[PDB]
Amino acid sequence: KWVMSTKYVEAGELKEGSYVVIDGEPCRVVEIEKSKTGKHGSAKARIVAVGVFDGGKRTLSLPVDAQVEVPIIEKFTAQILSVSGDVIQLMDMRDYKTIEVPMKYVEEEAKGRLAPGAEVEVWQILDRYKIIRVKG
Amino acid sequence: KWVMSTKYVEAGELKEGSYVVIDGEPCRVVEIEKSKTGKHGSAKARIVAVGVFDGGKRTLSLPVDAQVEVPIIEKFTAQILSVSGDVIQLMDMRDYKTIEVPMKYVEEEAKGRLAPGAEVEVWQILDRYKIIRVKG
Amino acid sequence: KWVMSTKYVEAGELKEGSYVVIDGEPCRVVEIEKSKTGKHGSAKARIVAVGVFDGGKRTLSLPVDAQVEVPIIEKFTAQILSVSGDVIQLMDMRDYKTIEVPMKYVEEEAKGRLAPGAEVEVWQILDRYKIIRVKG
Amino acid sequence: KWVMSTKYVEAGELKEGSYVVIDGEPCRVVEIEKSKTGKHGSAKARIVAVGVFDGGKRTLSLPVDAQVEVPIIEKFTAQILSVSGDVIQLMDMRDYKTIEVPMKYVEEEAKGRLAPGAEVEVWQILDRYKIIRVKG
Numbered sequence: 001k002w003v004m005s006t007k008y009v010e011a012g013e014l015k016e017g018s019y020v021v022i023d024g025e026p027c028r029v030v031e032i033e034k035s036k037t038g039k040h041g042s043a044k045a046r047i048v049a050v051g052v053f054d055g056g057k058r059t060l061s062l063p064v065d066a067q068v069e070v071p072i073i074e075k076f077t078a079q080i081l082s083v084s085g086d087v088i089q090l091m092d093m094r095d096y097k098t099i100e101v102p103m104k105y106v107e108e109e110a111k112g113r114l115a116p117g118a119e120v121e122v123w124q125i126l127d128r129y130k131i132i133r134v135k136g
Numbered sequence: 137k138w139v140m141s142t143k144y145v146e147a148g149e150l151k152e153g154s155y156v157v158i159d160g161e162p163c164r165v166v167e168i169e170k171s172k173t174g175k176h177g178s179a180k181a182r183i184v185a186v187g188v189f190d191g192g193k194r195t196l197s198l199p200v201d202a203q204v205e206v207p208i209i210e211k212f213t214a215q216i217l218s219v220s221g222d223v224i225q226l227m228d229m230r231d232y233k234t235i236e237v238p239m240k241y242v243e244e245e246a247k248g249r250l251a252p253g254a255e256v257e258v259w260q261i262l263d264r265y266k267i268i269r270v271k272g
Numbered sequence: 273k274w275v276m277s278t279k280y281v282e283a284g285e286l287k288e289g290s291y292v293v294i295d296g297e298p299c300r301v302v303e304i305e306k307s308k309t310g311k312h313g314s315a316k317a318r319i320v321a322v323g324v325f326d327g328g329k330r331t332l333s334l335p336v337d338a339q340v341e342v343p344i345i346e347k348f349t350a351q352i353l354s355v356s357g358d359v360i361q362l363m364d365m366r367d368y369k370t371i372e373v374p375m376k377y378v379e380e381e382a383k384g385r386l387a388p389g390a391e392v393e394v395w396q397i398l399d400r401y402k403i404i405r406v407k408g
Numbered sequence: 409k410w411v412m413s414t415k416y417v418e419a420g421e422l423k424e425g426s427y428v429v430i431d432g433e434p435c436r437v438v439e440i441e442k443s444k445t446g447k448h449g450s451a452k453a454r455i456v457a458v459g460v461f462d463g464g465k466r467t468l469s470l471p472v473d474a475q476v477e478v479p480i481i482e483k484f485t486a487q488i489l490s491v492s493g494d495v496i497q498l499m500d501m502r503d504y505k506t507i508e509v510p511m512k513y514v515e516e517e518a519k520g521r522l523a524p525g526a527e528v529e530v531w532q533i534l535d536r537y538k539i540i541r542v543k544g
Contacts, residue, residue: 008452022492023494023495024494037523038525041525042525044523044524044525057493058490058492058493058494059492059493060490060492061490061491061492061523061524062489062490062491062497063525066489066524067488080200081198081202082195082196082197082202083196083198084159084194084195084196084197085159085193085194085195086157086159086194089198102472115173115180115197116180116197116199116202117174117177117178117180117197117199174389184297198373216334217334217338218332218333218334218338219333220294220295220330220331220332221329221330221331222295222330223295225334251309252316252317252333252334252335252338253310253313253316253331266291274488297541304504320540348524352472353474354468354469354470354474355468355469355470356430356431356466356467357465357466357467358466361433387445387452387469388452388469388474389446389449389450389452389471390472
């Protein structure tokens, strides 16, 4: 079964705010450090990032010219249909279909304004969704 | 495979004591709050309920005219055949078949009078049973 | 797939030292209490037993004339081939085949004399074995 | 499905530093004790070893002439491609293929010098790999 073609960029091109996949988890880069120990060697990059879904800190150290996978992020608007303590039921405003998003995949800052009828900015990465903020 | 046709009611029709399904768990409603922030918008209902089987507190906030699933509850009488620390063996007085109910699915107030020979009120929701009280 | 024909006895026939199956676990009866609340009703028995394999306390309350399953226990002698912290390797002295028994299934009192070359009394219940004591 | 032919040696031939398999885990022998209780019996060996992969202490007591399985250890050199907090990506210098090794399978003393570009000594036992030290 196919899904998409993996997209890559050189590690040296990443910057704070960029998105990268580390050990299967799409992450947002929070810090990057460069170094060069080899007199005639390649520069290395040490990336620190945070998981978009599990919020876990991850690191990756590799040559600046080595490829790193970048997640494809689709952004769209949805309307909240209902809110339970565990799931947010949404109506995709693009095709009007109903999508369920776990409460754990809601940006902390947006949890406080979750209410039926409100519109939210949603991000889809592969088969998972994350509610970014209210309005959108 | 089919089982039953899901039954629904509008959220605004629920009352304390009503039964509803929230995230797959049939629950008894313990409190309902109504609100209306939109000048010309729909009123919203915030439901607080307790899981019939796991006893967990659950909440659901949605428009008063949105459909909410209501569990089908079949009530019947059974006779206790045996009682272990983990399972209550019962004889369904309708067809005389033997049914096993986990001790965790016995209302706390009824656990104290569980004894072989006693009759109990039993509730069946889908493929699970709950012992409500002794006698029935 | 068939295995054996379940053997039963009336609860009222059990005594301290008897073996019974409670919720799938073969247990040794440690105490039995009898009672009779119904003027013209059946006497009831409250059995307290201990799991042969998990060592857990279990109880069963039912009429004295109700059937209770009794495990089939096959006793034989085996020679210890090797002993690790987790498994005892044995040679069945009946057919000379090698059988492995988890350390958790060794009577506490026998663990202290487990040594290669020693003979032990082994009990087999269905597909599980328990080392009872050294010598046998 | 076949893999390899199990290799054995007599327990009495093992020495500190030897490798043995105890309950499915390849281990390095750290201590061996010999004894002989039977006037005309066989000498026994008590082996204490440490798991190559889980680092767990294991013991095995058996006759000195009893067979014990010895793991086949293939040693080779690899170059580190990248290092995350959970996985070390390596290039097998024999065929240039990429192999991923969990951080837990890296000798503690080598973890401190893990860096892209460094060469490491790698050990393969069946389908698992362990990074022994930097350089190799």
